[PDB]
Design a protein around this ligand. Structure first.
Ligand SMILES: NCC(=O)N[C@@H]1CCOc2ccccc21
Ligand SMILES: NCC(=O)N[C@@H]1CCOc2ccccc21
Length: 330
């Protein structure tokens, strides 16, 4: 089997991407944030505290003839941005882009933190990291990808995120029309439960490539690119007026600037992030100070290849017995 679904930016900045997902019988379609940095499929629901729902579409398990309560199971998760959610668990039929999994754990939110309530465009998350990170207790549950894997034509999914435009998540096949050149594959460590890999270095604009190992995670659930302070300082030093602002929480730059590109290494290959992808717009409405798309990972404890980096590539999440990641230009 295969599946193919369009993913769409939630706003004009590409702060996140939503993908329609069918849950239950008859189908209830929710728009979920596909997150290769976590491993829970959770949804706003008829059980979510009413004051914490503001415009989201909800899953109602009592209206699904295939829903079953997963007796005694609870879940609770916290994300890198400080947001959180928790609740109980159903199993149900879940379909993405024509690919169907029966008996998928669908985690129903009883509580969500304010940032989730405040984002009416995201109805929940669909985790695509390794199932060892799944938070369901006392019986840990599998991700949608792990459950689908044996049925897929090939044990892979691909992320092709758009810049200010829709893109595609495919399951079970590699669309050779969606990228240019060849795909370069690189080793993955699953020891922390993430799609963790080592970039071979970087360049700023037209500058020379610096060969240096950068361990980080491929994380579609993070908006920006978080790299070591040395690397980030070298980037922003090429932008007149750019500075790290403690009050704003990161590097800002004059909105009148033209940003240089940023290149990262994948083995001997190179992925170029155009300068425009690094502009996240005014820090507040009408400000002439703009927020940067490359930020320091110091005090995260890991580097994060988030959407800013991933949307410059066609990315293969290869879930073979020994997982690997593939990157191509597009
Ligand atoms: N976008 C990815 C993300 O925020 N993941 C969070 C942050 C810290 O690590 C974990 C571990 C397990 C589950 C979720 C997370
Ligand atoms: N991943 C697909 C791809 O890169 N195709 C290229 C684009 C340019 O045209 C040609 C002509 C012959 C062979 C390959 C290609």
């Amino acid at each position: 089997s295969t599946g193919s679904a369009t993913t769409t930016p939630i706003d004009s900045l590409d702060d996140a991407y939503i993908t329609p997902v069918q849950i239950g019988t008859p189908a209830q379609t929710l728009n979920l944030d596909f997150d290769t940095g976590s491993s829970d499929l959770w949804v706003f629901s008829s059980e979510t505290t009413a004051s914490e729902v503001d415009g989201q579409t909800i899953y109602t398990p009592s209206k699904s003839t295939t829903a079953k309560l997963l007796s005694g199971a609870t879940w609770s998760i916290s994300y890198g941005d400080g947001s959180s959610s928790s609740g109980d668990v159903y199993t149900d039929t879940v379909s993405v882009g024509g690919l169907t999994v029966t008996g998928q754990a669908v985690e129903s939110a009883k509580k969500v933190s304010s940032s989730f309530t405040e984002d009416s465009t995201i109805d929940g998350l669909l985790g695509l990291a390794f199932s060892t990170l799944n938070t369901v207790s006392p019986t840990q549950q599998k991700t949608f990808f792990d459950n689908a894997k044996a049925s897929l034509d090939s044990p892979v999914f691909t992320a092709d995120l758009g810049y200010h435009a829709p893109g595609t998540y495919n399951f079970g096949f590699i669309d050779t029309t969606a990228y240019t050149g060849s795909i370069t594959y690189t080793a993955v460590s699953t020891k922390q439960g993430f799609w963790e890999w080592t970039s071979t270095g970087y360049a700023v604009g037209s500058g020379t490539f610096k060969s240096t190992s950068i361990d980080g995670i491929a994380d579609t659930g993070t908006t920006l690119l978080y790299l070591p302070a040395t690397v980030v300082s070298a980037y922003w030093a090429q932008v007149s007026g750019a500075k790290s602002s403690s009050s704003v929480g990161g590097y800002v730059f004059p909105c009148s600037a033209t940003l240089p590109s940023f290149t990262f290494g994948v083995g001997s290959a190179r992925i170029v992030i155009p300068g425009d992808y690094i502009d996240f717009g005014p820090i507040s409405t009408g400000s002439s100070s703009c927020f940067g798309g490359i930020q320091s990972s110091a005090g995260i404890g890991i580097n994060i290849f988030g959407d800013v980096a991933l949307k410059a590539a066609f990315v293969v999440f290869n879930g073979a017995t020994t997982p690997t990641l593939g990157f191509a230009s597009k």
